[PDB]
Amino acid sequence: MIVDFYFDFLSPFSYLANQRLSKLAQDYGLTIRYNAIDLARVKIAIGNVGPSNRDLKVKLDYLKVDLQRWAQLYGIPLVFPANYNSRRMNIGFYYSGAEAQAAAYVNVVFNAVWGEGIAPDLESLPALVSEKLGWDRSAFEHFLSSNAATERYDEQTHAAIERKVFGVPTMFLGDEMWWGNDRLFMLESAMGRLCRQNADLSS
Amino acid sequence: MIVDFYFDFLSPFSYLANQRLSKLAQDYGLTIRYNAIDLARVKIAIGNVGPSNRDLKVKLDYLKVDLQRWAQLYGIPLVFPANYNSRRMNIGFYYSGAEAQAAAYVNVVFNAVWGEGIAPDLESLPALVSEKLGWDRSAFEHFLSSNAATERYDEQTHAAIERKVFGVPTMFLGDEMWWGNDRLFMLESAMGRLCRQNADLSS
Ligand SMILES: N[C@@H](CCC(=O)N[C@@H](CS)C(=O)NCC(=O)O)C(=O)O
Ligand SMILES: N[C@@H](CCC(=O)N[C@@H](CS)C(=O)NCC(=O)O)C(=O)O
Ligand SMILES: O=C(O)C(=O)/C=C\c1ccccc1O
Numbered sequence A, B: 001m002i003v004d005f006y007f008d009f010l011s012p013f014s015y016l017a018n019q020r021l022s023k024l025a026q027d028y029g030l031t032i033r034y035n036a037i038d039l040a041r042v043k044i045a046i047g048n049v050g051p052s053n054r055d056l057k058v059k060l061d062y063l064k065v066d067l068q069r070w071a072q073l074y075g076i077p078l079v080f081p082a083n084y085n086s087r088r089m090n091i092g093f094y095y096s097g098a099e100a101q102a103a104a105y106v107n108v109v110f111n112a113v114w115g116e117g118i119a120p121d122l123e124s125l126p127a128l129v130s131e132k133l134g135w136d137r138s139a140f141e142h143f144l145s146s147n148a149a150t151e152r153y154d155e156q157t158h159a160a161i162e163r164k165v166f167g168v169p170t171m172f173l174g175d176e177m178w179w180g181n182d183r184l185f186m187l188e189s190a191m192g193r194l195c196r197q198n199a200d201l202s203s
């Protein structure tokens, strides 16, 4: 069974969605196709150009409580990094090869940025992540600055916009799209239905 | 047990939150304090001045699916009215006296506007609602245009802004605030905890 998952490492809701999806992948063997995209570009594309939630103090005060609530529900830490400069790490996703390595990348970077609150533009973060994944630090850093890497990122963000993605985390299963970690229960129900039909418990 | 509920009849998420809260009120006798407020004013107050979700076609296309999903979950119709001009009906809430009459007003107006898709500024809607509630149509319509009615509305919206309400539906229980029909599960859990402690099942 395949879910397409769209995220931007600047998003704490994406951090939560990624933890929950990864546990479905590990516990139930669900297949996730990962897509790192530019939330900024996708917003601009649909004309969503007002102030961001991050720039609206009263709303941000609440969302920080909401985020701690879900973190507690999921039994994980959630710590705000010093900035939302996620471009380099988003691009770095496209170095990953196989499913297992793409998932490991996404989990290591999310845990570093939103689990530990490490700035996503920290200059040593590519090396720290390379060590964890057993990658060649220098090859990885060279990839991060390559024209091809930015092209791959641009391509995927474009494909997301074509698919009517307007925010993150967004998940597709078949023709159904859900936006939000708080919609994963709907994805989980859709998944159960498809499991039952494929088991002939349901027509 | 008392929940403060903040809503604007223009909000379909508020329509959903109201259906779920009303069923808690009827099934479990939870006490709801209702507050009709001006979502527009509360947004402006916190600097949330970009385009609204209603003006962003790609996002609105998705939210209409989200809204049908929840409507199906709750076993209720949800039909978009022709406009979001909720001021008159919001003001009309402050005609209501007791809890039972305030709840009946809110349920009748929500069901008319978002259950049936009746324009909230329809000129005959005050009379239709008056008939349903056994009110004096003319007294009700006179109240709707009164300076006092607008003052009461302005007062409550102000009190909401002071309480750091930035959107609707918003629910408070004690010092905890949740925004969204999709957060009522958290309110329900908080409510269960308080029931258990008061039953001495939990410290
Ligand atoms: N209710 C959410 C909201 C997710 C959300 O606010 N995502 C942000 C990025 S973290 C977003 O896509 N903003 C774009 C928008 O609001 O249209 C959930 O619980 O995940
Ligand atoms: N995730 C929500 C969202 C509720 C929502 O989008 N509310 C609108 C009015 S219907 C709002 O308060 N907008 C203000 C904002 O986004 O800050 C829920 O499921 O109820
Ligand atoms: O770029 C954005 O639009 C944005 O607000 C992302 C950051 C965010 C969203 C929601 C809650 C907290 C937070 O930092």
Ligand SMILES: O=C(O)C(=O)/C=C\c1ccccc1O
Pocket (backbone or CB within 6 Å): B010, B011, B012, B039, B052, B053, B054, B055, B063, B064, B084
């Ligand atoms: O006034 C607003 O800000 C607004 O978008 C309210 C309307 C709304 C919100 C979310 C989904 C559909 C919808 O009509």
